[PDB]
């Protein structure tokens with residue numbers, strides 16, 4: 001019962017499918033004489049409510065296992081390829097996941113296509129039990145999917161003038177309403193364009209550029225990756241953040257993430 005919920009929360013398992021996909025073994029053990037369909041649902045619902053309402057990205061991004069060799073880690077490599085001190089960069093990511101940098105609550109992965117921006121952002125978003133994506137096709141409710149999430153991934157679309165203030169709040173980690181409210185949540189933006197551009201009808205303005213970049217850490221990934229590089233895996237995310245935690249260095253609260261030690 002409640003022993004199972006503790007486990008689901010620890011493992012970040014929100015659905016029976018996931019539970020089976022990730023640990024088919026424990027699912028069969030647990031259910032063995034019987035498959036209480038109600039007990040299962042209750043545990044999952046409870047675990048999910050506990051995770052979405054009170055847990056944070058770090059609980060799932062930071063791997064539980066030691067990372068002896070981080071050099072093989074795709075995230076580490078991508079950062080390295082572009083001139084970033086992976087240890088310093090990891091600290092930015094670590095502090096970012098832990099809402100350590102005040103208004104700088106957003107990591108912006110900028111760069112031309114095939115640089116690994118989506119590879120990283122999506123791996124991270126899929127590592128946490130609950131993540132939301134900013135939906136610009138829905139001009140009315142662009143953040144509907146961003147409630148009670150551990151990571152918000154802004155993958156596409158431009159910010160509209162009608163939501164810029166809300167956007168600044170979310171990107172800046174300040175609670176804001178969208179009926180339903182978005183508590184501070186680490187945002188990761190991936191784009192090949194200046195997403196600080198704001199659309200107001202026929203007008204495109206950069207007047208909100210400074211406010212916007214005051215809430216971001218910007219990484220510039222320009223090194224096109226070989227089609228062979230591979231997808232950053234959930235485990236790689238875990239190892240990367242665990243490694244970051246075990247080797248954290250001081251980070252400067254600056255828009256541009258420096259390129260060096």
Ligand SMILES: Nc1ncnc2c1ncn2[C@@H]1O[C@H](COP(=O)(O)OP(=O)(O)O)[C@@H](O)[C@H]1O
Pocket residue numbers: 112113114115116117118119120190225226227228229230231232
């Ligand atoms: N699902 C995936 N499976 C295998 N490799 C992937 C996957 N997604 C990304 N990659 C790798 O990452 C590189 C960059 O693609 P992403 O799609 O990461 O790039 P972008 O920077 O344009 O968002 C590709 O060259 C590819 O090798």
